[PDB]
Amino acid sequence: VHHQKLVFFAEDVGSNKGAIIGLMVGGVVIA
Amino acid sequence: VHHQKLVFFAEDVGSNKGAIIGLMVGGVVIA
Amino acid sequence: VHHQKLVFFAEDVGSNKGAIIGLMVGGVVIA
Amino acid sequence: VHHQKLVFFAEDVGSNKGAIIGLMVGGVVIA
Amino acid sequence: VHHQKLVFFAEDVGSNKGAIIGLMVGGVVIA
Amino acid sequence: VHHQKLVFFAEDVGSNKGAIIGLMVGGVVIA
Amino acid sequence: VHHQKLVFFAEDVGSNKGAIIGLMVGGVVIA
Amino acid sequence: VHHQKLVFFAEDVGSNKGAIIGLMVGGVVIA
Amino acid sequence: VHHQKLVFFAEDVGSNKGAIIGLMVGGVVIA
Amino acid sequence: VHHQKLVFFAEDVGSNKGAIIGLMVGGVVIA
Numbered sequence: 001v002h003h004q005k006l007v008f009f010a011e012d013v014g015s016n017k018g019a020i021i022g023l024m025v026g027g028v029v030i031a
Numbered sequence: 032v033h034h035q036k037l038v039f040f041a042e043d044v045g046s047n048k049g050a051i052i053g054l055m056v057g058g059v060v061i062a
Numbered sequence: 063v064h065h066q067k068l069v070f071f072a073e074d075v076g077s078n079k080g081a082i083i084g085l086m087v088g089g090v091v092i093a
Numbered sequence: 094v095h096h097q098k099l100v101f102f103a104e105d106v107g108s109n110k111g112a113i114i115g116l117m118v119g120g121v122v123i124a
Numbered sequence: 125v126h127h128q129k130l131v132f133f134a135e136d137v138g139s140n141k142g143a144i145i146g147l148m149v150g151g152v153v154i155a
Numbered sequence: 156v157h158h159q160k161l162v163f164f165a166e167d168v169g170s171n172k173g174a175i176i177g178l179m180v181g182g183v184v185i186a
Numbered sequence: 187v188h189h190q191k192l193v194f195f196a197e198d199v200g201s202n203k204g205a206i207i208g209l210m211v212g213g214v215v216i217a
Numbered sequence: 218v219h220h221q222k223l224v225f226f227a228e229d230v231g232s233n234k235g236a237i238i239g240l241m242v243g244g245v246v247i248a
Numbered sequence: 249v250h251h252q253k254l255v256f257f258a259e260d261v262g263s264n265k266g267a268i269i270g271l272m273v274g275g276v277v278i279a
Numbered sequence: 280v281h282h283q284k285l286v287f288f289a290e291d292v293g294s295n296k297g298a299i300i301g302l303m304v305g306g307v308v309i310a
Contacts, residue, residue, distance in 0.1 A: 003034045005067045006053030011043040012073040012104075016080045016111065017172065017203040017234065018047040019093040019124070022068030022099065026058045027088045031050040043073075047080065048172040048203060050093070053068065067098045074104040074135075078111045078142065079203065079234040079265060081124040081155070084099030084130065089119045098129045105135040109142045110234065110265040110296065112155040115130030120150045141265065141296040160191045167197040167228075171204045171235065174217040174248070177192030177223065182212045191222045198228040198259075202235045202266065205248040205279070208223030208254070213243045222253045229259040229290075233266045233297065236279040236310070239254030239285065244274045251282045260290040264297045267310040270285030275305040 006022040018031045037053040049062045068084040080093045099115040111124045130146040142155045161177040173186045192208040204217045223239040235248045254270040266279045285301040297310045 001032050001063050003065050003068065005036045005070050006034065007038045007051060007069045008036050009040045009044065009071045010073070011041070013044045013071065013075045014046050015077045016047045016082060017093070018080045019050045019091050020047060020069060020080070020082045021052045021086055021091065022084045024052055024055045024058060024086045025088060026056060027086060027090060028059045029050050029052065029091045030061045031048070031093045063094050065096050065099065067101050069100045071102045072104070075102065075106045077108045078113060079124070080111045081122050082100060082111070082113045083117055083122065084115045086117045087119060089117060089121060091122045093124045094125050096127050096130065098132050100131045102133045103135070106133065106137045108139045109144060110155070111142045112153050113131060113142070113144045114148055114153065115146045117148045118150060120148060120152060122153045124155045156187050158189050158192065160194050162193045164195045165197070168195065168199045170201045171206060172217070173204045174215050175193060175204070175206045176210055176215065177208045179210045180212060182210060182214060184215045186217045187218050189220050189223065191225050193224045195226045196228070199226065199230045201232045202237060203248070204235045205246050206224060206235070206237045207241055207246065208239045210241045211243060213241060213245060215246045217248045218249050220251050220254065222256050224255045226257045227259065230257065230261045232263045233268065235266045236277050237255060237266070237268045238272055238277065239270045241272045242274060244272060244276060246277045248279045249280050251285065253284045253287050255286045257288045258290070261288065261292045263293050264295045264299060265310070267298045267300070267308050268286060269300045269303055269308065272303045273305060275303060275307060277308045279310045
């Protein structure tokens, strides 16, 4: 098991009004 | 097992009002 | 198990009005 | 188990009006 | 178990009006 | 001319991630 | 000309991550 | 011309992470 | 011209992390 | 021209981490 750079943003991000999750194990994501 | 760069954004992202998940194991995603 | 750089932001981020989570184990994320 | 740099911000961040969590074990995140 | 640098800010941060948590065990985060 | 209650929400609204406009005169709405 | 109660919310509103405008004259709305 | 109560919130509002504008004359709204 | 109560909040407001403007003449609103 | 009570809060407000402006003439609002 070798996790690396799961979510990558190479350039600029304006705003985040939702959810940014690299690794979610089960659970509930509501957006 | 070798995970790398699962979600990639090479250029700029305006806004995120939803869900960005690199790796989701089971669970519920509602958008 | 080897976790590294799960959420990566290479350039500038304007604002965060949501949720940025590197690793979420179960649970509930509401955005 | 070896956690390192779970949430990474390479450049400047303007503001944080939400939640930035490196590692969340269960629980509830509301944004 | 070896936790290190869970939330990383390489450059300057303008303001924090939300929550920055390196490691949250259960509990509730409201933002 | 008698405008009244152009957009009505009788019960609870969960979230607004788009645009709610009562009266728009020309212009551009992007969602 | 008689404008009144252009946008009405009778019950509770959870969150507003977009734009709520009662009366917009021209212009650009981006959401 | 008689403007009154352009945006109305009868019950409680949880949070405002966007823009609430009663009357906007031209201009740009970005959310 | 008779402006009155352009933005109305009848009940309690939890938090304001955006912009609440009663009357905006031109200009730019970014949220 | 008769401006009165442009932004109204009838009940208690928890916190203000954004911008509350009664009347803005041009200019830039960033939140």
